[PDB]
Amino acid sequence: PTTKPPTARKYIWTNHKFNVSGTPQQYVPYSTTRKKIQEWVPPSTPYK
Amino acid sequence: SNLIEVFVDGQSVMVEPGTTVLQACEKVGMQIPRFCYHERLSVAGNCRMCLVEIEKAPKVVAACAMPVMKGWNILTNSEKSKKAREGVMEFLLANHPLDCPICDQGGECDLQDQSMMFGSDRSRFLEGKRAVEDKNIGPLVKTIMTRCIQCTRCIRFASEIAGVDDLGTTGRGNDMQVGTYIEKMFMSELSGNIIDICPVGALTSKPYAFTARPWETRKTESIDVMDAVGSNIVVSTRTGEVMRILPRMHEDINEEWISDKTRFAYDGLKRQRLTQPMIRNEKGLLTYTTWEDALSRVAGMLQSFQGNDVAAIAGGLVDAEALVALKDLLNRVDSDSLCTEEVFPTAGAGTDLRSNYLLNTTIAGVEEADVILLVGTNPRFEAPLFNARIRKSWLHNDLKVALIGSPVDLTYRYDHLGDSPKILQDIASGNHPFSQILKEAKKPMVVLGSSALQRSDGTAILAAVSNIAQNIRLSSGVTGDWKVMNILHRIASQVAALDLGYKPGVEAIRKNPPKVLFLLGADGGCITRQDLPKDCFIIYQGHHGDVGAPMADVILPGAAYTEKSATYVNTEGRAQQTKVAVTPPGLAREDWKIIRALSEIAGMTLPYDTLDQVRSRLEEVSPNLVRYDDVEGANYFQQANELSKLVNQQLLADPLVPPQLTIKDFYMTDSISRASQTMAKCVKAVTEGI
Amino acid sequence: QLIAVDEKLDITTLTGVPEEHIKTRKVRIFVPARNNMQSGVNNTKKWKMEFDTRERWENPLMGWSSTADPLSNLVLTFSTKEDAVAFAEKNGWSFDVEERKVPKPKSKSYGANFSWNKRTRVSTK
Amino acid sequence: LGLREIRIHLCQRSPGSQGVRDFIEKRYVELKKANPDLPILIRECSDVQPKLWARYAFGQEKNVSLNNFSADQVTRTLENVLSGKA
Amino acid sequence: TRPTIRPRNDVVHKQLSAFGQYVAEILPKYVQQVQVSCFNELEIFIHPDGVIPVLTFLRDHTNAQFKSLADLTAVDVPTRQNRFEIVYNLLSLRFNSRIRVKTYTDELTPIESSVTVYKAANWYEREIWDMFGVFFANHPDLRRILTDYGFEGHPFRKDFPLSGYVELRYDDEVKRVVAEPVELAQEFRKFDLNSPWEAFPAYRQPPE
Amino acid sequence: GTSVKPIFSRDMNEAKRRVRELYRAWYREVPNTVHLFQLDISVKQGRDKVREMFMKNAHVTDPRVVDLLVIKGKMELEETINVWKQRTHIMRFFHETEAPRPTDFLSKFYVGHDP
Amino acid sequence: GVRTSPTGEKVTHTGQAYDDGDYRRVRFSDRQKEVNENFAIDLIAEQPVSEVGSRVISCDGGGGALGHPRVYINLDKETKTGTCGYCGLQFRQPHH
Ligand code: SF4
Ligand code: SF4
Ligand code: FES
Ligand SMILES: [Mg+2]
Ligand SMILES: [Zn+2]
């Protein structure tokens, strides 16, 4: 990469990170989609 | 008989005169490739994909338009036919955009599939492609017209089926564009069908856009409950979630079309849902609880009261299993106050004779009938597919249509007799020209709308309509087995409830107010707490929080129509069953199971444990409920008319005004469509154009 | 020499299927409806047997769709309705049979597009 | 003892329901006028056999076969059911 | 039809057709059908009773000499009254040829074991019994070969589910591996792939 | 006529005799299985379980199906005697880690949707 | 275009964040929530609209065969720009 430097992009990490498994920086999976079914909200006032 | 003999690849076929080459080919199980031809639309012959060689004929013919001649040998797989198909496919693909990854049609695209089956595998087009601008025609049908292949299917559908002449072609040559030429919305109760007939991704569903691919969807064949037409549908699901609704072909009900409410209101199934049992707090607010506690409270109240003190109201989306379970449970308490929201006249035969509250001609019978009189109805919005069938027979059989009521747009020309109810009597006495028109008809049809029935005099209107039908029956002789008297329903649950013995309307509850009131999906606002004694115990069972849920003491979450296998009877009297597409959300349960569990906790256990046993009980109450495609029935018009002649309730001087006057009133008529954001967008679009 | 039995065929005890997935299941025997998005009819030729749809839920990790019934993806293909009925009967499955739906033959006339006195006349091409 | 509903299940064209059909054609109207507030639900059966159901107070109900009955026998059966018999 | 298309061999096609006619003439008691495919493969469809007499003939006749049993497997076709198709693939080294012998059976009808004809058949028959439930009469030692001990069902049947009915895990309360009804965190996603347009007109069936 | 080929037995009597032979073999084998596999159950528990497994198929009336069931039972016994099965396979008959599934309508209603 | 929730949890570009009462947040204790900081929608929002002097423009995403399938975009409408359905790049004919 000294004679043939990589192409620059603004989204490329400027700081390389190593394998962070076993550390508080480790990756934790989670669902990335929104809630599908919306529940009815009962009225907040007494009905009688 | 009059058949002629043709040959398909040397195989003999007998066809009737007027059969086209394409139809003769499909008589032997050979499907000719097509783009512009549709068997429910007029022949166009413009796509040229159906070109096929006739033996000893130098020039290929368009199989979709060419009548087949006697002795012709159609060569479906000859070199000439295959080369013609390849050339036409090349021409179709020359300007088509490379959109398949981003096009919603991909995977269920007739252009893609017929390119793979009948086209070549590469390109030799070395020019630039044409690109056209997009047309905004509403919030339902997304338009990307660079993909348009100029089939003219949408134009022919809009003109012939929907009766709207707003689509067309502008320009000519390579520059010909399909559209409206002005910024205009194609808002029809049948508009969404142009998505399905469009072979390509030019017209797509806007609510469905980008969400799923065809190969990952599971198909559940079911029935629509948005009206009383009972259109056969397919629910597409993926990974436990409803994706979209598609028509399912049934020649005698809906053909291959559905209304826009059937097609697009499914998103309301994802909002305002009841997922847990609820009970009132010490303060008076609704709070979640377990099934055990809520059912125990309901059972204690049920054991407290008896007879008239207990009543139930059935909503418009209730199935027959839950209806019969609730009727059995309230009969165990010795209560007969089983009511629906939709009023039907109980005078005379009432619900004793089934043909008294049915569309006895049936939807298919409209094709046969020479004349039809509509009273107090706006069939276009109350029963869109029935109106489509009426327009079909108006177009093809020159049917004469007359309307008594408000002069609504029905997408076909009709003779408007007025809106005064007295016209009926004026017709029945013979003092009207239309009386003579009806007398000389060979297959007359009288349709009375159930919406007209909502009015208090409803009984007088029914008596007058029956008297008109009796005059037709006696004066014009007997034609055999042709039914004249018809009732058109708008409520999916009404006919099953009438078959099971429910009392139409809530008049019984107003006569004797109950201490305990069961609301089974009832969201019409017919009975409020101002109509009931104070400290009345109200139980709401359903799937959505509408008008009914807030005023109840206890909420029992039930299953929607896509979440259960359940029986619905349409306007014709035909029983059909849905299937489970997705299970009920949260703690919600099947409705008849809720009632059976309640009966067990209350000590009066019902004799059925499974769905088969509940359907056996249905057979014990009304056997026609287990015959799942039967539409046949006995004609008991004479007895019903004779009994209706008993009392002489007076008509009112109020013009027949249907609840649905324009398109904006059509989109929201039930708890599911009121919760639908797509229907809200449609209402907003038709109210203000912009 | 043959032994001349006289009882209906029943292989439930030999298939290794759990009891619950024999007596509580309902199979549907039907010819699948044409997908309305396409005009091809090649997927409407054979009979299909499928099972009743059971519960699917959300996996707490990843939000994937989880199931517990082993028959959720079982679809069998048959040449006729009678073959499917026989197969369902010998396996002890309760079944619901839906009759085949064929489109009715239709009268197509191109010339009717230009009728002298009928309503079938088209206003555009 | 408290009669609540009557149900008559007859088959449309089976011979065994002929008498029931005769009844519905001839004597149903007078029966309905005599008992205007009593539900008499006329429904159609598949070919098993004609039936008459009577539903009483608190959900108890009885059934009686009408197979091969004449109009007279159906009339007698309905007369006994509507009165203090059996 | 040049570079892209696979070439034909009329000589082998004719030779195989003639030998199939030969076999059918010699054994009319059992041979029900003979076929030669367009890629030059000979199939003989026989009644089950002839499994042993036919195979023996094909092994021992001077003009057949099919000494090698390459493979023996079963195919499940639930629409047929006789569910299971039994397939024998044989190789003759003397004549450098291959042949296929086909027969049928249902769930309750035994098929004669062919270990006395080909010893190689032994394990193959075991596998069939393991995967399809076809019982072979007079097999020297017939038992499961591929499945777990105590496994219930025959996995290769079309109506057997892909993931089966039970799965395994280690349980610490009992300190052992246990079997429990199968539960999947992600359900296998069924795909509907068939195009609704016919692909091969040469295989179109009559529309009944 | 029905023209059906037998497996071992011509009628139900010979099939029942083969069932009795297999039952005797299993009953004799159970104590050896308890000793060899070092099970924590009693011999009575194992024999009760053997009886239960046999009783599971009491309703069968087809002699061919009975013959095939006896064949499968003989295979299982041969697996057990030769210690091809391990302790996990033997204990799989008892389902000691599966929670008791309710049978009455109300408990199934509370817990979920399955009929 | 990252953004934080009332709980302090970063909101992803999919708009997914655990509610205040959601137990599943426990999975991030003593650990972190992986979030990509380069929001594509904002990045494509910063690209300028290209002025071209033709009614139809061609886009393949740059790089020739290293881009996306080449599509043609109509620019007749003066009320809006022409957007590429693959790349998001915008085009228009000179106006004003
Ligand atoms: S319409 Fe069909 S061929 Fe055209 S881009 Fe869409 S999927 Fe591809
Ligand atoms: S939008 Fe579809 S139906 Fe209309 S002309 Fe174009 S391809 Fe044909
Ligand atoms: S299908 Fe006949 S020309 Fe289009
Ligand atoms: Mg389309
Ligand atoms: Zn681009």
PDB file of C-alpha atoms in Angstrom, chain B residues 306 327-328 331-336 348-354 357 498-501 617 619-624 627 632-636 638-640 642-643 646, chain D residues 2 4-5 7 9-10 12-13 21 23-26 28-30 32-33 35-36 38-48 53 55-61 63:
ATOM      1  CA  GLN B 306     -81.067 -15.349  34.137  1.00  0.00           C
ATOM      2  CA  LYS B 327     -76.666 -18.996  21.419  1.00  0.00           C
ATOM      3  CA  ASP B 328     -76.266 -22.334  23.214  1.00  0.00           C
ATOM      4  CA  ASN B 331     -80.063 -20.723  26.051  1.00  0.00           C
ATOM      5  CA  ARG B 332     -78.541 -22.582  29.011  1.00  0.00           C
ATOM      6  CA  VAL B 333     -79.358 -19.470  31.080  1.00  0.00           C
ATOM      7  CA  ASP B 334     -82.845 -19.482  29.444  1.00  0.00           C
ATOM      8  CA  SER B 335     -82.219 -16.294  27.462  1.00  0.00           C
ATOM      9  CA  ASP B 336     -83.477 -15.868  23.899  1.00  0.00           C
ATOM     10  CA  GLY B 348     -95.035 -12.502   8.839  1.00  0.00           C
ATOM     11  CA  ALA B 349     -92.747 -15.418   8.045  1.00  0.00           C
ATOM     12  CA  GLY B 350     -89.787 -13.488   9.438  1.00  0.00           C
ATOM     13  CA  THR B 351     -86.730 -15.717   9.548  1.00  0.00           C
ATOM     14  CA  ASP B 352     -88.796 -18.926   9.552  1.00  0.00           C
ATOM     15  CA  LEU B 353     -88.525 -19.230   5.757  1.00  0.00           C
ATOM     16  CA  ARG B 354     -84.941 -18.951   4.532  1.00  0.00           C
ATOM     17  CA  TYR B 357     -84.032 -13.149   3.452  1.00  0.00           C
ATOM     18  CA  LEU B 498     -80.593 -15.564  10.656  1.00  0.00           C
ATOM     19  CA  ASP B 499     -80.134 -19.252   9.793  1.00  0.00           C
ATOM     20  CA  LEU B 500     -79.196 -19.958  13.421  1.00  0.00           C
ATOM     21  CA  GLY B 501     -82.297 -18.218  14.800  1.00  0.00           C
ATOM     22  CA  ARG B 617     -73.820 -28.768  16.343  1.00  0.00           C
ATOM     23  CA  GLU B 619     -75.617 -29.189  11.407  1.00  0.00           C
ATOM     24  CA  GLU B 620     -78.062 -29.941  14.228  1.00  0.00           C
ATOM     25  CA  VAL B 621     -79.293 -26.328  14.211  1.00  0.00           C
ATOM     26  CA  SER B 622     -79.244 -25.542  10.470  1.00  0.00           C
ATOM     27  CA  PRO B 623     -77.862 -28.266   8.159  1.00  0.00           C
ATOM     28  CA  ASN B 624     -77.170 -25.971   5.173  1.00  0.00           C
ATOM     29  CA  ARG B 627     -72.741 -27.751   2.835  1.00  0.00           C
ATOM     30  CA  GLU B 632     -79.728 -24.586  -3.965  1.00  0.00           C
ATOM     31  CA  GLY B 633     -82.821 -24.153  -1.829  1.00  0.00           C
ATOM     32  CA  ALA B 634     -86.569 -24.463  -1.696  1.00  0.00           C
ATOM     33  CA  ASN B 635     -88.747 -21.606  -2.937  1.00  0.00           C
ATOM     34  CA  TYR B 636     -91.226 -20.620  -0.221  1.00  0.00           C
ATOM     35  CA  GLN B 638     -96.119 -18.047  -1.592  1.00  0.00           C
ATOM     36  CA  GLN B 639     -96.222 -18.675   2.159  1.00  0.00           C
ATOM     37  CA  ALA B 640     -94.018 -15.667   2.922  1.00  0.00           C
ATOM     38  CA  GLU B 642     -99.392 -14.676   2.328  1.00  0.00           C
ATOM     39  CA  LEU B 643     -98.005 -14.137   5.833  1.00  0.00           C
ATOM     40  CA  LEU B 646    -101.404 -10.027   7.434  1.00  0.00           C
TER      41      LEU B 646
ATOM     42  CA  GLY D   2     -91.627 -24.224  28.243  1.00  0.00           C
ATOM     43  CA  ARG D   4     -89.012 -22.049  22.913  1.00  0.00           C
ATOM     44  CA  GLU D   5     -88.424 -23.048  19.294  1.00  0.00           C
ATOM     45  CA  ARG D   7     -87.104 -26.596  13.803  1.00  0.00           C
ATOM     46  CA  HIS D   9     -85.415 -30.138   8.704  1.00  0.00           C
ATOM     47  CA  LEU D  10     -86.715 -31.459   5.387  1.00  0.00           C
ATOM     48  CA  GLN D  12     -85.679 -30.761  -0.982  1.00  0.00           C
ATOM     49  CA  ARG D  13     -86.363 -33.681  -3.335  1.00  0.00           C
ATOM     50  CA  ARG D  21     -93.123 -30.895   1.864  1.00  0.00           C
ATOM     51  CA  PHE D  23     -97.198 -29.899   5.101  1.00  0.00           C
ATOM     52  CA  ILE D  24     -95.051 -26.881   4.265  1.00  0.00           C
ATOM     53  CA  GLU D  25     -97.109 -26.304   1.129  1.00  0.00           C
ATOM     54  CA  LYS D  26    -100.498 -26.603   2.806  1.00  0.00           C
ATOM     55  CA  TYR D  28     -97.568 -24.143   7.551  1.00  0.00           C
ATOM     56  CA  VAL D  29     -99.298 -20.787   7.024  1.00  0.00           C
ATOM     57  CA  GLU D  30    -102.179 -21.511   9.404  1.00  0.00           C
ATOM     58  CA  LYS D  32     -97.694 -19.714  11.835  1.00  0.00           C
ATOM     59  CA  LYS D  33    -100.772 -17.515  12.250  1.00  0.00           C
ATOM     60  CA  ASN D  35     -98.509 -19.209  16.858  1.00  0.00           C
ATOM     61  CA  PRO D  36     -97.151 -15.856  15.643  1.00  0.00           C
ATOM     62  CA  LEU D  38     -93.090 -18.983  18.094  1.00  0.00           C
ATOM     63  CA  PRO D  39     -89.999 -19.472  15.881  1.00  0.00           C
ATOM     64  CA  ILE D  40     -90.585 -22.295  13.391  1.00  0.00           C
ATOM     65  CA  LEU D  41     -87.312 -22.559  11.477  1.00  0.00           C
ATOM     66  CA  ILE D  42     -87.707 -24.425   8.178  1.00  0.00           C
ATOM     67  CA  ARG D  43     -84.329 -25.717   6.979  1.00  0.00           C
ATOM     68  CA  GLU D  44     -83.105 -28.108   4.298  1.00  0.00           C
ATOM     69  CA  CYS D  45     -81.351 -31.424   4.972  1.00  0.00           C
ATOM     70  CA  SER D  46     -79.071 -33.625   2.953  1.00  0.00           C
ATOM     71  CA  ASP D  47     -80.539 -37.009   2.202  1.00  0.00           C
ATOM     72  CA  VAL D  48     -80.220 -38.541   5.740  1.00  0.00           C
ATOM     73  CA  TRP D  53     -86.560 -30.462  16.750  1.00  0.00           C
ATOM     74  CA  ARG D  55     -86.129 -26.579  21.992  1.00  0.00           C
ATOM     75  CA  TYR D  56     -87.425 -25.977  25.521  1.00  0.00           C
ATOM     76  CA  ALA D  57     -86.374 -23.819  28.460  1.00  0.00           C
ATOM     77  CA  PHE D  58     -82.749 -23.819  29.649  1.00  0.00           C
ATOM     78  CA  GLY D  59     -81.373 -25.385  26.470  1.00  0.00           C
ATOM     79  CA  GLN D  60     -83.036 -28.811  26.581  1.00  0.00           C
ATOM     80  CA  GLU D  61     -84.221 -30.043  23.204  1.00  0.00           C
ATOM     81  CA  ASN D  63     -85.763 -34.569  18.089  1.00  0.00           C
TER      82      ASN D  63
END
